[PDB]
Write a protein that binds this ligand. Structure first.
Ligand code: HEM
Ligand code: 284
Length: 292
């Protein structure tokens, strides 16, 4: 097992990272046309998850620490198709703040997107350090979408996530859309595509889902409202243990926010050793809170 010790960018503190957060948040507001006016929030959340989701608890390979998405093997992962849009969004931010590590930037993009979309506060820690190209994990560590509840449960054990953590994390599927050209799936998960709510769970329980084939010849569950669920999403109401948790989150917005915040921070920090004297996690103010 590799050890990755968090190392604070030299001399930086909360205020420096709040400036980076603010730059990301301002660009999120500015570049509003993207993806038929969804904006960049959802793709930034997906990027933060995919750079973290390569982690393997068994040997501490992959994970957000090394910023390895910047290397061709990882950014060309078929599982990452479309994330180049998020990377391009972050490029001017990195140019303005060249001192931030790549892993810190990609993970902070996800935190900023969740909060700016009115989601929960997500505490965030700095100190990821870029590692060399040979530390890039091979393709194939991110999950397939065509599988069942047992696949999802087993998959997430590798990321040290339990049933509650898995169901909470999947609530991010309220955001954005599937794009046929990226993933072979098409459509949004609900009405509020760029506002962070518990709608994923409500839609799973309340919509009338039909199992259909899309134009890429893949199965997905579709509702007459024009929403979709991946087979892996739908598995959360097929498995009785997942179903209980889906119902809980559909009925308690605050509980979902609190559990999502914990699981998402954990996801973004998997693989990182934080020294005992490392700074406490930062909680960034939103632009709205700052009057900006
Ligand atoms: C079983 C696990 C998962 C599977 C199989 C899966 C699969 C997918 C697929 C196929 C897409 C569509 C990509 C595209 O066509 O552009 C997508 C989108 C998305 N996923 Fe997941 N995902 C999983 C878990 C997660 C998790 C844990 C998160 C974050 C907490 C997440 C966040 C998102 C977001 C925000 C989008 C929308 C991206 C956009 O609008 O550009 N997903 N997911
Ligand atoms: C916006 C998309 C809706 C889902 N149900 N799953 C993937 C993300």
């Amino acid at each position: 097992t590799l050890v990755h010790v968090a190392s604070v960018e030299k001399g930086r503190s909360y205020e420096d990272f709040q400036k980076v957060y603010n730059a990301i948040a301002l660009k999120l507001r500015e570049d509003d046309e993207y993806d038929n006016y969804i904006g960049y929030g959802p793709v930034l959340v997906r990027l933060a998850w995919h750079i973290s989701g390569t982690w393997d608890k068994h040997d501490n390979t992959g994970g957000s620490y090394g910023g390895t998405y910047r290397f061709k093997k990882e950014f060309n992962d078929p599982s990452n198709a479309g994330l180049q849009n998020g990377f391009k969004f972050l490029e001017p931010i990195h140019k303005e703040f060249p001192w931030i590590s790549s892993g810190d930037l990609f993970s902070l993009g996800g935190v900023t997107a969740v909060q700016e979309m009115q989601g929960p506060k997500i505490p965030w820690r700095c100190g990821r350090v870029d590692t060399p190209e040979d530390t890039t994990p091979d393709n194939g560590r991110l999950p397939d979408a065509d599988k069942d509840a047992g696949y999802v449960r087993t998959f997430f054990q590798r990321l040290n996530m339990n049933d509650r953590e898995v169901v909470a994390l999947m609530g991010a599927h309220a955001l954005g859309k599937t794009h046929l050209k990226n993933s072979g799936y098409e459509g949004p998960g609900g009405a509020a595509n760029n506002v962070f709510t518990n709608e994923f769970y409500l839609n799973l329980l309340n919509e009338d889902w039909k199992l259909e084939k899309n134009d890429a010849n893949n199965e997905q569950w579709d509702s007459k409202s024009g929403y979709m669920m991946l087979p892996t999403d739908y598995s959360l109401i097929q498995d009785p243990k997942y179903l209980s948790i889906v119902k809980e989150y559909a009925n308690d917005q605050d509980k979902f926010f609190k559990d999502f915040s914990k699981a998402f921070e954990k996801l973004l920090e998997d693989g990182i050793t934080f020294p005992k004297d490392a700074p406490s996690p930062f909680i960034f103010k939103t632009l709205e809170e700052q009057g900006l």
